[PDB]
Design a binder for these strands. Structure first.
Ligand code: NA
Ligand code: NA
Ligand code: NA
Ligand code: NA
Lengths: 132, 130, 133
DNA sequence: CGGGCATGCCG
DNA sequence: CGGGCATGCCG
């Protein structure tokens, strides 16, 4: 069953690697709760990872334990392992997204949380609420 | 829990793509109920697909409602989708395996079967029978 | 059923990537017909590829129409494609294996042959006669 | 498509 | 075990 009192996150991207952005929304109402403006170079998995950790921090700051939904098997695993295993080259052109990933990993390594991170079941429920 | 009153299918593959064979067994006895003679070139997933559909036909012909276990989540989806989304090249040397896939796909598009198709949970239960 | 009047090839490696060697033997008698001394760094699949192409050339110069057996379906396909699809980095340490693979591809791309390259069916026939152990 | 993943013979 | 080779959801 869908947990309606939850937050849903999703990446939007052009190419992969390419321009990436993400947002987090109320799973029921669609209210946009946070967003990340387009990053010129990134990968889908890096964006999905940042989006979950942003939701974790958003909810922690508000003393909320409600679940987060993502449709990214890879990003959910990366968050559980506290390590984003991206193959994207790290240089001056990718320094932005790599710094954001560094900071997300740092947050996960320095905080605990009860937030359930749940797989959105696209085949059953249709597109995730935060889809672009 | 393991539904013991079932069939289990397994595929044997010498490389991938490569020589492929399969069989269906009684989950509780290991009796071999049907088998496919080696196929010169196929993929593991095509073997698993064909093995499921063979078991579906075998069970329907016996008016059996036993489930089928497969270790292959991909082939289970293919059968539920009625379409084997294989990347194997269609040419003269793979004609046989693709012929067999097309016949199985035929059979799925004209029958609505009773058989539950279950994933064998090797990580908990050990190797699928044979 | 086995074509006993044939060549069988096999590869021995220590590590992967690692030290690679290979040999070709008379399937019927077990006699070593050719053997490649240790190559310091290569992959198993590159070694299996080189061994088949060595067999092709060995049979061609001996005016032989005998087939080759290999237990590597990967290397059989690579030979069929005339391309060894190895991921091994090209650098100074891998220069020798890559030179050999590049020369083997050149030979395949400039020569025709009728030699059947056949899959040795280990689980059904036992260990290939050229096995290292 | 690419990104990463799940899953499929040899040292 | 891990690594070289493969067959196979989401933007
Ligand atoms: Na997504
Ligand atoms: Na998502
Ligand atoms: Na396969
Ligand atoms: Na190899």
């Amino acid at each position: 069953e869908i947990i309606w009192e939850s937050l849903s996150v999703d990446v939007g991207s052009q190419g992969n690697p390419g321009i990436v952005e993400y947002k987090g929304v109320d799973t029921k109402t669609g209210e946009v709760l946070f967003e990340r403006e387009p990053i010129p170079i990134g990968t889908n998995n890096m964006g999905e990872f940042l989006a979950i950790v942003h939701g974790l921090r958003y909810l922690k700051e508000r003393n909320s334990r409600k679940p987060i939904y993502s449709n990214s098997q890879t990003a959910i695993k990366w968050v559980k392992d506290k390590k984003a295993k991206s193959t994207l080259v790290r240089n001056e052109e990718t320094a932005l997204i790599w710094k954001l990933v560094d900071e997300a990993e740092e947050w996960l390594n320095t905080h605990t949380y009860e937030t359930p991170i749940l797989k959105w079941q696209t085949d059953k429920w249709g597109e995730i609420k935060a889809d672009y």
